């Protein structure tokens, strides 16, 4: 199906030394019997679990095709390159865990469109630029870790960010704001 | 004098015109009088005249060496799988003695030279795996002796030409994998009386299949798959006397499967899957001794004719995604080396046939979303060929045969949503290749066998909605490749041990709605990839371990237990309000 | 080298 085609596209771009994606057979009608993929009762992907798999390479925009995806777990890998902007098309996403990777570039402003997101852990990456203000409009956000990145600029302190502590924004290149040690220009 | 030649000098000019990084042409010594013993060079007669040049997979880079046409007796040229680049030159016609030309798997680009039709001796033209673009030249209709035309995997962007039907000598028409402008199959292709192969896969074909194709009595392979063909499969195809393979899959074909297909004595492979075909699979077709019948993802209805079991050659039947009713043929697999059976997403009823793996070659049994009833045939306990078993979403009952648990090459065993009873046999230890075990929503009873832990490669154990009981076997904790453990809605009893530390790759632990007792072990924190934990609906007791805080959990439920003490600092937030409900002393 | 899918039956399965 389209969801399987999208996940197979990710497999082709990722480097898989331990053949964790061996079961990802595109000839299957759906990816629900694929290991590391969990589907709902209507056979739509709700979970991708690939944490600590020694994966390398880069993510794909086609991950955005997974409309019902709720948990994306790509943490503790060596994935490089940008966080795809199309991840903002994952309306039902509850967890985005890209932590302990070599991700670079900006945190996409598209991530603000994730209305049901509760967990955003982008920590221990090489991400750069400013924290998007759109993330404040996510009412459901309860866990945020942007720490150990090379991020800079004002840290939003309103909406969901109202309750966030300094541990979330620690060891960044040039973050400014009340949570931070240094105040803003 | 008359029959002296400079064939060696001409080949040296070819060597000079091409890059040879791997020194494939080292044997081509200018000093040798004759080129006949040089690598890839053959002289089939007197006069030391070069008749054949084969430089296949030589890593030769450069444009087509037009000087080679000065070899007067060259009948066979192959530059297959090289880096030959640029446009194919119009002066290729100077090679007037060429019978076979293979320039496949090269970097040739641009429009096809019309002068290819000006070589009268040409029988075989293969330009597969090139970058050729533009319309097929009108000259191609005028080929005098061409038997094979292959333009497969190019960038040809024109309409499929009716003039290609004018090559009376043609035995094989291979235009597959080209971005052709959407076009109908020319009815003039029916005029190709000697045609044995029509390969037009992914050629953007539109319109109806012409009845004229029925006149092709010598046709062996008809492949019109991966197109947008509309209308009925022509009853005229009964006229294809010598046809062995018919591929019509992934089109927009409608209407009934013609019974005239029964008249095709040599037919062995038919795939008309991923269409909108309606009506019943004809008995006359099923009477033919087919090797492969694929009619999946159609709107077919009615019973599968019992005649299909008569074929001694059947290894593949994929008819899933239809509204087929009734029972499978009683003798299915008895007389045939059945390898692949997929009847999933149908309205099939009754017992599974008893002899599906009689010939010992069955690898895939896929019958999900049917109303199949009764017990698993005892014969399947000896079917060691099986690799994928999906009996899910059926009305099956009774105990699973002992051997079926222990089949050596089975990767996935799925018995979900049946009324299967009895226990998992100790034979499960023999399932060396088992990765996914899914037994959820059955009536299974008893303790998990200790031999389940002998499955080092087990990745998923899901046995929810069963009447399983007893303490978890100690061996289950030894499973280091286990990512999913779902045992919710059972009668499991006893305590978790420090052995849970060995579940290093476990992502989901669901032990909810059981009768588990004891403290949650402190080793729960050692589980680095655990993101989903449900221990709800149990009698777990004592202080929630401090290590649980360290875990990055997307789902936590410790609700309706007997847990006591102050909530670990980190877990005492507003987000975990529904995670620890129903614990009085917490 | 382009791998050309051979003329034969489709391989989709459950
Ligand atoms: C124009 O288009 C046609 C249609 O696609 C092409 O034709 C066919 O060409 C393919 C490629 O060679 C043929 O495929 C093969 O069958 C051969 C003959 O077969 C039988 O005998 C073998 C051996 O005992 C049995 O296994 C088999 O079941 C048959 O009963 C085989 O010898 C070939 O084998 C090889 O490849 C496979 C897969 O890689 C290996 O596993 C094998 O070890 C072996 O090396 C092959 O399977 C097919 O038969 C042709 N069909 C017709 C109708 O003619 C033309 O080639 C194409 N031409 C151009 C120029 O494009
Ligand atoms: C099509 O023709 C090609 C010939 O040009 C065939 O390709 C080649 O295939 C052989 C055998 O599989 C390869 O050989 C191996 O070489 C490695 C060492 O290699 C590499 O180093 C060379 C240095 O020149 C470099 O060109 C390659 O890219 C590699 O980096 C050995 O360790 C192995 O034991 C073995 O000898 C060739 O290297 C390879 N060459 C190229 C250029 O691709 C191809 O198989 C043909 N295809 C078909 C379907 O027939
Ligand atoms: C056609 O190819 C020749 C030979 O080059 C090689 O094959 C090519 C397909 C490509 O893979 C090149 O990188 C290879 O080196 C081309 O010729 C030569 O041009 C280069 C500079 O670009 C020069 O340094 C070499 O000495 C040249 N060698 C020869 C034998 O001419 C040629 O330009 C290509 N033509 C076209 C139209 O693509
Ligand atoms: C959080 O604070 C920011 C900064 O004041 C708010 O900001 C902007 O929102 C307005 C109107 O909604 C936009 O026109 C501006 O373009 C935004 N400015 C910046 C600097 O991003 C934001 O709306 C607040 N969010 C919530 C939920 O209160
Ligand atoms: C394959 O063929 C296409 C179509 O002719 C080539 O496309 C173009 O490339 C040429 C050659 O440099 C350019 O001059 C044109 O402007 C391009 N036109 C179009 C319509 O894309 C393509 O480069 C060829 N590829 C290879 C590997 O040879
Ligand atoms: C159909 O095929 C015939 C036979 O190959 C083609 O024939 C000839 O036409 C040319 C050009 O007019 C003559 O010079 C030849 O002498 C003819 N040969 C024969 C044997 O008749 C004919 O051109 C093709 N027609 C089309 C429309 O492609
Ligand atoms: C698969 O099995 C489950 C369990 O028997 C079925 O689920 C239930 O649906 C009925 C209504 O039809 C409810 O009353 C039950 O309470 C449900 N139970 C559970 C445990 O979820 C399910 O419908 C079955 N079939 C399919 C196609 O999934
Ligand atoms: C996340 O990144 C931080 C910073 O790169 C890692 O940091 C630290 O731990 C090391 C232990 O080997 C120390 O040597 C560093 O000095 C220390 N630095 C800071 C700023 O804390 C941290 O280990 C990473 N997290 C994980 C889970 O690996
Ligand atoms: C076969 O060829 C004749 C003469 O060239 C032509 O009139 C006829 O239409 C062709 N057949 C079909 C089915 O078109
Ligand atoms: C079927 O054809 C469609 C295009 O119409 C394509 O998108 C799809 O991938 C094809 N699938 C198979 C199995 O051929
Ligand atoms: C295990 O099953 C897989 C998937 O079908 C198969 O490819 C592999 O060869 C099997 N290995 C063994 C040891 O049986
Ligand atoms: C925990 O389980 C109970 C019932 O078993 C349920 O009502 C509650 O919502 C669950 N809590 C969470 C956090 O999902």
Author numbering:
A (entry chain BBB): 27 to 211
B (entry chain AAA): 13 to 598
C (entry chain CCC): 65 to 78
What did the publication describing this PDB structure actually write?
Here we demonstrate that HSL1 binds IDA/IDL peptides with high, and CLE peptides with lower affinity, respectively. Ligand sensing capability and receptor activation of HSL1 require a SERK co-receptor kinase. Crystal structures with IDA/IDLs or with CLE9 reveal that HSL1-SERK1 complex recognizes the entire IDA/IDL signaling peptide, while only parts of CLE9 are bound to the receptor. Our work reveals that HSL1 is a receptor for IDA/IDL signaling peptides.
The vastly different binding affinities between IDA/IDLs vs. CLE9 to HSL1 prompted us to determine co-crystal structures of four HSL1-IDA/IDL-SERK1 ternary complexes with: IDA, IDL1, IDL2, and IDL3 (at 2.31 Å, 2.38 Å, 2.20 Å, and 2.70 Å, respectively) and the HSL1-CLE9-SERK1 complex at 2.87 Å. IDA/IDLs adopt a fully extended conformation in the structure. The co-receptor SERK1 interacts with the C-terminal region of the different IDA/IDL peptides (residues 68-69 in IDA), completing the peptide-binding pocket using its N-terminal loop region. Superposition of the four crystal structures yielded an R.M.S.D of ~0.6 Å comparing 590 Cα atom pairs, with IDL peptides perfectly aligning to each other. Our calorimetry experiments reveal that SERK1 binds HSL1 in the presence of IDA/IDL peptides with a dissociation constant (Kd) of around 15 to 50 nM, indicating that IDA/IDLs promote a high-affinity association between HSL1 and the co-receptor SERK1.
